[PDB]
RNA sequence: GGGGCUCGAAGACGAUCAGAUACCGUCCUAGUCUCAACCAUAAACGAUGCCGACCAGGGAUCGGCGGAUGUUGCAGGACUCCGCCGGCACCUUAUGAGAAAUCAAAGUCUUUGGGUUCCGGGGGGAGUAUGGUCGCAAGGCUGAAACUUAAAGGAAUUGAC
């Protein structure tokens, strides 16, 4: 059954970004869906996307520019420190320089650098690069 | 000594080239060894291996021995060359010749800073080749190379100073080990880092913006 | 890319496609690049051009002659035909 | 056993393809200009190659071969230029188009074209 | 960098290294200190610079003396 | 010329006829389908699709290394002309293996530019440019591939009348772009049908 | 317990053969059929656990439904064309994977993480010994150790046969 609506959007999305599509449908969309989205479109790694009200649990159609080699969830939700997070980007990210790691912090959904900026720590939802 | 046969070489050999990265730029298919030569000023070249295979007829086995060799100057350039002959001499100089032709340019990044001569990979780069994958991650500036003879004698004619590698698979097959390890090198220019993502400014291939000289001045 | 001075460290800076925006690499033999020559309004090629790069992957797909199609139908309103 | 080396079969295309201005049907004729226009040692070779030579006439004869050139097409030139119509063979009137082409020539087409037909 | 368990012991590692005379004054980084080799140890061994102050005609009659 | 007189010269010449089916490739060039099945496809986007094709062709001004190839043995009287009109080259029926690729090979040349009349026909010379960065251009037809060629000309090429009128078409709008012929009219009469 | 045609483990005879408790012929017992109870195993195989998402194309076919269509010695049924859902499969091709055969799933894997059950750790000894447990029995489920060994094995290649 769908036991994680965010796998499934990160990996049809990822999934179409490999086959050079421009625009990708994500269903269901949820709120903690569009966070993700939102922290990836803000740090230049997509582009538009819309939602659209089907009154039961909405649609995404996200545009793509290209840019996103690689996104996808961690599961189970691991809870870090903020002593923890040079760990993690050690093991998901491919370098120091760039690079992202998504928490589900106490303060919102973040990336990880926003998370060291707050002192905040967390579980981590996935990542993007 | 030297009469070019393609328009690549015939455009080489009277000097309309510096270096060799617009030939990379256009991605054209360089198929005369001596380009290579003219145009990349240091080349060395060890042989890895001389292993013979064999055939079996139906009166005894035939032995041919196949020889490996790794090309390229420790400045970012690399190339791998494969012969198999009937005996060990022109394996080898076949190999070189190949291996010459078959040189690609690397990218080397930084660990964490940006002071001069970067010394590593940018990113975690892996390569297959059969069922030996090879893997190489970004290092700080004192590790030095981490990897059996063989990645370490391809990656220090790469220009690598420091790296962590990684195998898996039957890394005692030498040519699939070295294939992998070069093909990943190859990858290392290959990945879309954010600083790349400024829009592309597009330049006149050689073949496009030198026909003057190329209609029918055949040889002269 | 760039250094703490502010220079280039790389060899070259690659091609990307113009469709898919994956990067050309220096082995890609399927990759090619197709420059589209423009008119007046008599009809007459006016010696300028607009270049467009292809990578293998879009190529061997099967679409590169819609993302092309496409790519000039959307490249002509800026400079009219 | 009678089949020709590829030698004689080469040397007789050769000397058609060059010299088929005088050469002449009879084998005998064939080997007196064969023996001054090229040098053959062996004399049954000449003679293999006279022969071969005389069947390939009497082959072309009829028509072209697959095995020579030059005069491209047997001895003179120009041969289908000339087949051009004082009128072209495309018409323009009621030109064959149906119930579906109609619908398109309501489409972005213009539906009063000069070659529209009902049919 | 803000990191006081990165300031402290780095000024110490670089006040360590500039006493011995192994980073010079134009690299006061904690990059430049990743950067340092063997040769850069040895040439500050008594014997070394005893040899290469004009003492010793060899640097193995520097060890001698 | 004006698209109309081209629209209505490939209505006379059956351009618009399509096959009993479609690859998923094409349906932005078919208009629709005949109760028969045959395809009907539009020539509207053909005209600017070999007029972009023209646009391309007359980039490079080096008209010698420009092959145009045919191997199906119906077409061959097209591309037999299309090379003297302009300064392409032009090779009829057969492609031997390894004259893109093999530089040792006697008839080695490397274009800048392929011109096929169907993909499906000669695919060795499309899989063998593949290889070398050689930019395609072919006459494709419905039920036929689109595996390396770059711009599809949407036509017929198994018409006596298909085949010929195009080539000499996209041959007029070429010289037309090129300024030899100032605007007038046919001097060519059509010449390249099949005898 | 009934039934008991045909076929046929065991057994007998003929034949072949250096020998033939086998292959070939003939006659046949338990069995093969059925009813009321036991057994719980098969190359029980797609040698591919179940649920969910995405990722190429194509045509055929089965069940249902929507539309168009113009023929039936007769709205509907039969037939033709288009579309949707569900199923058994098939063809082409990787831009995918794989040691490869090959696979449109055996793909979306060092750029490694959707959920969950079972299960393997070089080849033998060995599915053996013993204990436990189910069965009338034949047997089933669970299941070692000492000792021995440098290979056993998979896919493909060239010869030889
Ligand atoms: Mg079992
Ligand atoms: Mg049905
Ligand atoms: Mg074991």
Redesign the interface.
Known sequence: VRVSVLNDALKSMYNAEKRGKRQVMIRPSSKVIIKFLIVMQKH?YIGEFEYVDDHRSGKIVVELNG?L?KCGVISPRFDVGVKEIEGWTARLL?????GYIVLTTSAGIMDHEEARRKNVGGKVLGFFY | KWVP???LGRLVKEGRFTKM?????????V??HQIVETLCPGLKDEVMKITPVQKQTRAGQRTRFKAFVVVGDSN?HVGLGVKCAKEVATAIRGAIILAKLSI??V??????????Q?HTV???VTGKCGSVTVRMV?A???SGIVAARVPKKVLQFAGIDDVFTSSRGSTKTLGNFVKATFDCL?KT?????????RE?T?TK?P??EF?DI???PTKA | ?????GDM????????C?AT?????????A?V?I?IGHVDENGLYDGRFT???LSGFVRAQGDADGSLDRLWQKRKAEIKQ | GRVRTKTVKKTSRQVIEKYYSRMTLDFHTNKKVLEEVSILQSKRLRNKVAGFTTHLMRRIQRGPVRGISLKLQEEERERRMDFVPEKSALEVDEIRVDKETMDMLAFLGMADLPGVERA | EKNPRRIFEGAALLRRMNRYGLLAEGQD?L??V????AENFLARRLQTLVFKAGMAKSIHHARVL | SQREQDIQMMLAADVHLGTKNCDFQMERYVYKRRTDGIYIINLGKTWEKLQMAARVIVA???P??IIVQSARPYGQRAVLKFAQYTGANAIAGRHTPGTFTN??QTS?S?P?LLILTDPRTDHQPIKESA???IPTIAFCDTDSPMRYVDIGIPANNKGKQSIGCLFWLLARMVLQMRGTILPGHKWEIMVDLFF
């Open positions: 230049g840019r080699n491919p370098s120091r320089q760039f | 046969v393609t328009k990265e617009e030939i990379y730029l256009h991605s054209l298919p198929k005369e970012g690609v340019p990218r080397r990044g930084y660990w964490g800073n940006k002071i001069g970067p940018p990113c975690k970004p700080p500036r004192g190859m220019y290959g990945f879309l880092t954010p600083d790349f993502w592309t597009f291939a073949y496009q026909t190329l209609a029918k | 890319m760039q250094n703490e001075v460290v790389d060899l070259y800076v690659p091609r990307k113009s925006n994956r990067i050309i690499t220096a082995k890609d033999h990759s690049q420059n270049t467009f790069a | 980084k990059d430049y990743l950067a340092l080799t | 490079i001004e080096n010698q290394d530089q040792m080695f490397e800048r290889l070398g960065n």
